[PDB]
Amino acid sequence: RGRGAPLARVQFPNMRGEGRVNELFIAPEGMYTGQEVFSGNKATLHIGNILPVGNIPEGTYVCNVEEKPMDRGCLARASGTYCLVVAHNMETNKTRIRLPSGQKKLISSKARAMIGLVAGGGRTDKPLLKAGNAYHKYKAKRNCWPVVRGVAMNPVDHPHGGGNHQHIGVSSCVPRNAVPGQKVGLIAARRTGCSGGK
Amino acid sequence: PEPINARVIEVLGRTSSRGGITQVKVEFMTGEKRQIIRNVIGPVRKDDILVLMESEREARRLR
Amino acid sequence: GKKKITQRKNPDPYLKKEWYPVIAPAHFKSRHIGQTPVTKTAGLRVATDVINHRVYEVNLGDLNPGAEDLNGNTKFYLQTQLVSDGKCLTNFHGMDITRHKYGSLFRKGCDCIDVFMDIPTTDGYLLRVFVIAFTDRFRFQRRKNCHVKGRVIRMMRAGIYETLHNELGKVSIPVLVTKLSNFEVNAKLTEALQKITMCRDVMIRRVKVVKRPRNTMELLSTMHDSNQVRN
Amino acid sequence: EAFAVCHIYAGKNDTFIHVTDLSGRETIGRVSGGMKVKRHCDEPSAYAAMQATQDLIEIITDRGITAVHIKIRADGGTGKRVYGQGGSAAIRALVRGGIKIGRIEDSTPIPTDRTRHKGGRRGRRL
Amino acid sequence: PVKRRNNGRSKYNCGHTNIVRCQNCHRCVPKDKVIKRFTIRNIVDNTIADDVLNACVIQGFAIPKLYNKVQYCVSCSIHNHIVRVRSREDRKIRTPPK
Amino acid sequence: MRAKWAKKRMRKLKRKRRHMKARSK
RNA sequence: GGGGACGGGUGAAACAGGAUGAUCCCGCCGAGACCGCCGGCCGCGCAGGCGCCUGCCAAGACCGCCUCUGUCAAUCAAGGGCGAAGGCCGGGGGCUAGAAGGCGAUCAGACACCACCGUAUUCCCGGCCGUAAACGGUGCCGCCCCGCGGCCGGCGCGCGCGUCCCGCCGGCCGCCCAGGGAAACCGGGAGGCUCCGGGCUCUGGGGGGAGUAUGGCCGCAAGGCUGAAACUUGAAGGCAUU
Lengths: 198, 63, 231, 126, 98, 25
What we know:
This is part of a larger assembly, with chains A, B, C, D, E and F.
Chain A: E1 7-13, E2 20-26, E3 50-52, E4 61-63, E5 83-89, E6 94-98, E7 104-108, E8 112-115, H1 131-141, E9 173-174, E10 186-187
Chain E: E1 19-21, E2 28-30, E3 37-42, H1 49-55, E4 65-70, H2 75-78, H3 88-92
Antiparallel strand pairs in E: 1-2, 3-4
Chain F: H1 2-23
Chain D binds one RNA strand through residues 5, 7, 9, 12-14, 16, 18-21, 23-30, 32, 34-35, 39-41, 43, 78, 110-120, 124-126.
């Protein structure tokens, strides 16, 4: 309901019983009804297979990576996102991955990942177009819409509050150690403004 | 280092665009007797002995 | 003795700087590379562990003395791996020709065939071997230019790759250093290319260690530690 | 014979005669033209290079470097590729002082392919 | 009128050549319209050549040669005298002087 | 390059003349 | 990590860089661009253009030919596709250089040249734009034409036998006999033309005004394309000689 990315129900055999176990996963693009996915150390390198990232070669696009061993997956889970296997440090049994934000993190080689980009990519390209479409999307997620600017509000309601000319009146940049009511502007901004570079 | 005297072996020519510099190849009168080329001001001729202040510095050949 | 502070006074930074002998692999006739100065063990920097992986460029003319007409324009890079008995045992890090040699091979009128083959050694090292080959004028010929037609270039490029595979396919780092020191492999590639067309200056210009295994102490005993094994 | 490598940076703007111990990790002494000259344009000059060495040589002889391998370089990279006037003097000043030369080599940094050099397509229209 | 048949560049069977930078002036000139002079000078000065050899401990050492190709633009070449304004007849002479 | 600078001046003036017509009509 | 005091930059400087250890040396790593020397009177492509390695995919001219077809052709309004760079619109990416901007000089002034920092841009993908001194300032297809050389590709002939030699065909070129031209020059044409006619398309008609105005079409825009008149003036221009 609340996720743009599609979710796939993959049925596995029960290994502690005679039944079958149903597991819901984030769907990597290319998962089809009837695809035989494999989970494990000896799983082959095919999209939708889950293997430890030390086995996974470098340059591979993976998703739902485990931040720590046996975490059940915490990393690239949003639509179209992917992590990249960057390097393997055999001596430390640690694998560097490039997170979707372009940050690089060292994870355990044991930590497992599902091969493939997560589906639903290009979801953000279409303009919402109408306030309506935002209403529909936010209903599925939580009450965070519509957003009222604090300059519009009274001085009691918000720090930016309200004067005669609708202005912040003090720097929007607020410190990192600001208290819960005070932290309303740009938090610990290392720099501000629209400028080219990086 | 005291200056070392050197005798002119060949007067190479007149330089400085005003001719006042004279280019001369000078062989150290005493010592290793290296033949270096040094700029000179004034009237100079073959076998003229002039004390070189450093001698480790030489002008561009025939320039 | 090539040392200073070990036995004598020096300037203030070098007052605490002892010197350690560096020794090349057994294949080379001149084992002594030289002395390396390291500051004495201060706190967390053991002097021996500071000179643990230092790579020195030594001319093959220096490493193997004798005629410089042959071997005088090649340099081997030897990286210290272990420091034993206050001496730095060294292995292989790369081989290259000198800049003077590289610019001498090039001439107008000729065709340059330069290709790289990544050859894994049995020792667990991945080596990128760069070989440069130049087409030469025929014995007689009418035209001044020594340029070849495509069929010839394709055969030369293929024969370079094919002969490297036979020469250095099952090579090991000790065997490879011997093959580089006496240029057998360079001669073999020259012979094959000569059959295709008149060729000149066909030799491995540079070899590089792309991936090196760790714990290469067994490799040091075969090479630097013992001469009898490398025969 | 004790041997070091004396990198000679012969470039426009300044000359650096710097001696390092083979590996290049450790320096047995470093000198520049601008450390021996007061005029900025005389920094790349033969006199400063001859003054800078003979002062370098004193430090390295104290440190016991009897002989040196020369590795002269130009500004190199995307520009220059020719040595400055000081570069010749530095080798001559090392030879005269009693440093035995070993291998002279060209260490100019040279590009297999290059990033656009400074100056514009029209160039330095001085 | 048209001073030169080649148009000042050697472009034949071509619509576009590579771009070279004049070393002194740092300008962009086509490869065909460039001075292209290749020079092999010994690494050391010929005045200091013999004394380097005497100093050199290595026996049989040969002084390194420096191999470089100096490419310049017409303005950054006529002013350095690498090429000279020639007479209309002398301009036609394609043979290198000396 | 007076002829190129002449066409730069002309384009700038025709742009302005378009703006005045945009203010009207 | 080492070492110690000035580095940068210039024509000479200066502004930034440095005991928070700069410059320099060496190891190592990340990022993106780019492919040197070879590299050219080399080649390919319809032009614009095209150079890392290793594959994959589809081409094209040329040559050879006792293969097939049988005029299927030439040139082309409208129409279709392509088109350097810069620009623009979405995504990215961001090493260098660097329109703008800021500085330090210069100078009488200098918001120019030169130094320095640096945004768009440069690079990729999906599009727009539709222009260049897009030049060989030389449309295309066809015929004949004078020698003398160079290179490239294919093929044939002798000959010991060589990346020979002599041809042939296609291409790229240099010199040039006539011939042409106002001459420079062209001569593989700008020859065979006041002794004027092979076919086809396009453009010009003194110099401005003016590629302006207005109308149309096209593009998101920048702009493109089509394109005046009133009015002004006696030269404008080419090539050569001094």
